[PDB]
Design a protein around this ligand. Structure first.
Ligand code: NA
Length: 129
């Protein structure tokens, strides 16, 4: 599923991401824009053999099982395919664990490089929230 900007903002707010660990909803929408272009089915293979999955490009090295990332963990206790669903529940629940990990949203390269320090509220501007 490819979400609209305001459609994703509404879904993330319903699932409790607005101000989760102090990160405003615009931070999460900005991260999803630059990680996946709002596409739940996005996948990207990394140099280390791990893969990034879904709207927030969550990595198989630590967070999910994809059956082909040797010596990796599954800290969200999910198959990586769960992160590709039209329903963002699994991605949101796993993102909450990731952002609690120590480096906050710096865990998302696209957030650090393209969202951090910018007018992230622009990403929810005009939305009926
Ligand atoms: Na894994």
């Amino acid at each position: 599923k490819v979400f609209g900007r305001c459609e994703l903002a509404a879904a993330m707010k319903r699932h409790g991401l607005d101000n989760y660990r102090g990160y405003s909803l615009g931070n999460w929408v900005c991260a999803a824009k630059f990680e996946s272009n709002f596409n739940t089915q996005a996948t990207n293979r990394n140099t280390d053999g791990s893969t990034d999955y879904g709207i927030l490009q969550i990595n198989s090295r630590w967070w999910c099982n994809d059956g082909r990332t040797p010596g990796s963990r599954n800290l969200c206790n999910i198959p990586c395919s769960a992160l590709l669903s039209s329903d963002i529940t699994a991605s949101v629940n796993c993102a909450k664990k990731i952002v609690s990990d120590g480096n906050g949203m710096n865990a998302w390269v696209a957030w650090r490089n393209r969202c951090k320090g910018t007018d992230v509220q622009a990403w929810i501007r005009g939305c009926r929230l």
